[PDB]
Structure formats: structure tokens, C-alpha cells
Write an enzyme that holds these catalytic residues in place. Sequence first.
Site, PDB file in Angstrom:
ATOM      1  N   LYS A  24       0.673  -1.083   0.083  1.00  0.00           N
ATOM      2  CA  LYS A  24      -0.057   0.119   0.045  1.00  0.00           C
ATOM      3  C   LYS A  24       0.957   1.203   0.125  1.00  0.00           C
ATOM      4  O   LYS A  24       1.964   1.362   0.722  1.00  0.00           O
ATOM      5  CB  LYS A  24      -1.014   0.004   1.103  1.00  0.00           C
ATOM      6  CG  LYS A  24      -1.904   1.213   1.395  1.00  0.00           C
ATOM      7  CD  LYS A  24      -3.404   0.733   0.592  1.00  0.00           C
ATOM      8  CE  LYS A  24      -4.414   1.711   0.729  1.00  0.00           C
ATOM      9  NZ  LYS A  24      -4.079   2.978   0.358  1.00  0.00           N
ATOM     10  N   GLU A  29      -3.619   1.050  -3.440  1.00  0.00           N
ATOM     11  CA  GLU A  29      -2.601   0.001  -3.388  1.00  0.00           C
ATOM     12  C   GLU A  29      -1.703  -0.149  -4.435  1.00  0.00           C
ATOM     13  O   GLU A  29      -1.937   0.268  -5.512  1.00  0.00           O
ATOM     14  CB  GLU A  29      -3.735  -1.220  -3.458  1.00  0.00           C
ATOM     15  CG  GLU A  29      -4.545  -1.586  -2.344  1.00  0.00           C
ATOM     16  CD  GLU A  29      -5.579  -2.971  -2.423  1.00  0.00           C
ATOM     17  OE1 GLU A  29      -5.951  -3.001  -3.538  1.00  0.00           O
ATOM     18  OE2 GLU A  29      -5.642  -3.542  -1.391  1.00  0.00           O
ATOM     19  N   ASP A 136       6.953  13.222   4.871  1.00  0.00           N
ATOM     20  CA  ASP A 136       6.752  11.839   5.471  1.00  0.00           C
ATOM     21  C   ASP A 136       7.843  10.920   5.636  1.00  0.00           C
ATOM     22  O   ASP A 136       7.924   9.783   5.389  1.00  0.00           O
ATOM     23  CB  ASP A 136       5.456  11.023   4.818  1.00  0.00           C
ATOM     24  CG  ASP A 136       4.817   9.953   5.625  1.00  0.00           C
ATOM     25  OD1 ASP A 136       5.171  10.073   6.992  1.00  0.00           O
ATOM     26  OD2 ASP A 136       4.102   9.148   5.123  1.00  0.00           O
TER      27      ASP A 136
HETATM   28  C1  3JB Z   1       4.728  -5.300   3.565  1.00  0.00           C
HETATM   29  C2  3JB Z   1       5.134  -4.407   2.310  1.00  0.00           C
HETATM   30  N1  3JB Z   1       5.123  -3.485   1.969  1.00  0.00           N
HETATM   31  C3  3JB Z   1       5.749  -3.355   0.970  1.00  0.00           C
HETATM   32  C4  3JB Z   1       6.001  -2.108   0.062  1.00  0.00           C
HETATM   33  C5  3JB Z   1       6.493  -2.436  -1.333  1.00  0.00           C
HETATM   34  N2  3JB Z   1       6.469  -0.999  -2.312  1.00  0.00           N
HETATM   35  C6  3JB Z   1       7.237  -1.063  -3.343  1.00  0.00           C
HETATM   36  N3  3JB Z   1       7.514  -2.315  -3.529  1.00  0.00           N
HETATM   37  C7  3JB Z   1       8.533  -2.254  -4.482  1.00  0.00           C
HETATM   38  N4  3JB Z   1       8.710  -1.460  -5.510  1.00  0.00           N
HETATM   39  C8  3JB Z   1       8.360  -0.126  -5.124  1.00  0.00           C
HETATM   40  N5  3JB Z   1       8.143   0.980  -5.966  1.00  0.00           N
HETATM   41  C9  3JB Z   1       7.652   1.855  -5.270  1.00  0.00           C
HETATM   42  C10 3JB Z   1       7.198   1.389  -4.102  1.00  0.00           C
HETATM   43  C11 3JB Z   1       6.371   2.245  -2.971  1.00  0.00           C
HETATM   44  C12 3JB Z   1       6.476   1.997  -1.867  1.00  0.00           C
HETATM   45  C13 3JB Z   1       5.877   2.664  -0.695  1.00  0.00           C
HETATM   46  C14 3JB Z   1       5.113   3.740  -1.123  1.00  0.00           C
HETATM   47  C15 3JB Z   1       4.768   3.947  -2.214  1.00  0.00           C
HETATM   48  C16 3JB Z   1       3.703   4.943  -2.909  1.00  0.00           C
HETATM   49  N6  3JB Z   1       3.072   5.857  -3.052  1.00  0.00           N
HETATM   50  C17 3JB Z   1       5.496   3.458  -3.573  1.00  0.00           C
HETATM   51  C18 3JB Z   1       7.437   0.043  -4.022  1.00  0.00           C
HETATM   52  C19 3JB Z   1       5.243  -0.760  -2.221  1.00  0.00           C
HETATM   53  C20 3JB Z   1       4.453  -0.520  -0.927  1.00  0.00           C
HETATM   54  O1  3JB Z   1       4.528  -1.733  -0.157  1.00  0.00           O
HETATM   55  N7  3JB Z   1       6.298  -4.522   0.482  1.00  0.00           N
HETATM   56  O2  3JB Z   1       6.083  -5.171   1.614  1.00  0.00           O
END
Ligand code: 3JB
Length: 291
Positions: A24, A29, A136
Site C-alpha cells: 500500500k 494499493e 513523510d
Molecule cells: C509489507 C510490504 N510493504 C511493501 C511495500 C513495497 N512497495 C514497493 N515495492 C516495490 N517497488 C516499489 N516501488 C515503489 C514502491 C512504493 C513503496 C511505498 C510507497 C509507495 C507509494 N506511493 C510506493 C514500491 C510498495 C509499498 O509496499 N512491501 O512489503
Amino acid sequence: GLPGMQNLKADPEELFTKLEKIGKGSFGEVFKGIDNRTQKVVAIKIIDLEEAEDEIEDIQQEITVLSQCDSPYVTKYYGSYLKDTKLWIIMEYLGGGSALDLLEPGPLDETQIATILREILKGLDYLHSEKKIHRDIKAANVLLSEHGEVKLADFGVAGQLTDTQIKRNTFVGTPFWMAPEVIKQSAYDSKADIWSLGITAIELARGEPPHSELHPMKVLFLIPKNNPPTLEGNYSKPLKEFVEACLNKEPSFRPTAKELLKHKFILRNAKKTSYLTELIDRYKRWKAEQS
Ligand SMILES: Cc1nc([C@H]2CN(c3ncnc4[nH]cc(-c5cccc(C#N)c5)c34)CCO2)no1
């Protein structure tokens, strides 16, 4: 009229393949995806415009902030697409996990803390020079690639300074990491991110920010009232001094991100980001063995 939706594209399933949920972000999401032209993996944030009501104004701002950023220390945004009631925000995929996830198996050493901080500082220096405030900054919003590259993510509450607006006053952020002037809703600027960075340094060293066991409503009075936090424990004198420099109640006494890049703690301890793969592997091993 929409000024920030000038470059809004259409038919995203013609250029991208949507895969599983990975987490999220602000207002929506995040899903894993594939760019069908290059075969590279992407992150696809989906914001349901029907369910959105007051956040719509901030969603327009998040697209704008991400589109105006071009740095290796900030998650790249590849475009926004309208598909019926759903808005797709195509983002850079980072497969190493967040700094907060990398803290789950155990503590970091000071080389790892300095390396992560230096990369966050380069991202902050980029953003602050472009008159943007992240607002943040916390370990959960610091993402790593599978090779240990460190980038800032989640620009959902990001602020923009202009020639007519030299300061912001909006109550946004995560309470434990918020600067005193932000909670007080006084006029603030990029120095609010320097306070948040100091809290993030405590979080990288201790695993949690100050007051982490308290309800967040209680920290809303404790932070403006109390003396600023300090880093307690057996840590090197430059790390304690780095935290102390960031955590000054007077924002003008906090150094800039550019000045902190030259701090004794960063200079003495930061090493190549490739070494962070050891933390990513520790996390994978830890996650696989958890019941
Ligand atoms: C638990 C858990 N939570 C997660 C993270 C993983 N995450 C990402 N994973 C991989 N590539 C990514 N590129 C950009 C993001 C990203 C992260 C946070 C906010 C935003 C926004 N707006 C974008 C991202 C998405 C959020 O949840 N993985 O495991």
C-alpha cells in the site's frame, strides 16, 4: 480544469501487464507489473477514483510531484493512466524491501546506518533544491533495489514551495516523525524533513522512533513540549552528534541536507550501497523462517 493532468495517458493494459499486490501507498494499493515493451518490472499504484472524495486534490498533487522529479534517489514515475474509474500510477519497482523491513531481523551496524542516511540525504538535497518537502520521511518510505540502491518513496503528502508560498502549515506526516512546528501547524519548510531525518536516524539505530509505545495522539503534545530526543545507547559520538544536529527545536539551527552530507558520521562510516545486499539477504532468510 486540471493543470497537472496535461500529460494523462490512456489504455494502460496496451503497454503494461498488471500482476499481484505488493503493498500500500498513499491513497492506493501498489501492484507488481511488467512493461511489455522492455520486459522490465514496474510498480503499479491503483487509485479508485469512485472511493476517493477529499484526497482527490492530493492525488492530483502526488502525480504532479512524482512527474516533476527526476533523480536516482527518488522513485521514478513513468506516467499516469486513466482506465474507467481507476487511475494507474506506473512507478519504478524496487525489490529489496523498505529500510523498515530490513530492520525486522535485527539491528543495523553503523556502516549500514551511515550508508542508508547518506542516500536519503542525497534524495533530500535533490527535493529541497527543487523546493519540495517530502513531509513523510521515515524508514517505511525508504526503499531499496535488489542491489542495495536506496530511494525515497511515497510522495502522497509532499509539499511544494513557490515564489508566492515560501512556507507550508498543513498538519501532515506520521506523528512519531513529525517536526514540532508541523504539529503546531506553524509556518515550516524543508527543515521539517531534517527533523524527520533525525528521527529516522534514531529509528535506523534503535529500530523504532522515540515514543513508539505511546498512542500517536499523546505524541502530539509530547513532541512540542519535551526537550528534543537524543540517541541513547552505545553508539559512536559522531552518530549521536548527527542526531542531535537534526533534532533542534529551532528549525533554522538544523543543518541542510547538503551540510549533513559532509557530517563526520557520514564521511567516516558510509560505504558502497552494494554492501546493503547483505541486509536484503538477511531479511529474505528471516522472512522465510518466520512462523
Ligand atoms: C509489507 C510490504 N510493504 C511493501 C511495500 C513495497 N512497495 C514497493 N515495492 C516495490 N517497488 C516499489 N516501488 C515503489 C514502491 C512504493 C513503496 C511505498 C510507497 C509507495 C507509494 N506511493 C510506493 C514500491 C510498495 C509499498 O509496499 N512491501 O512489503
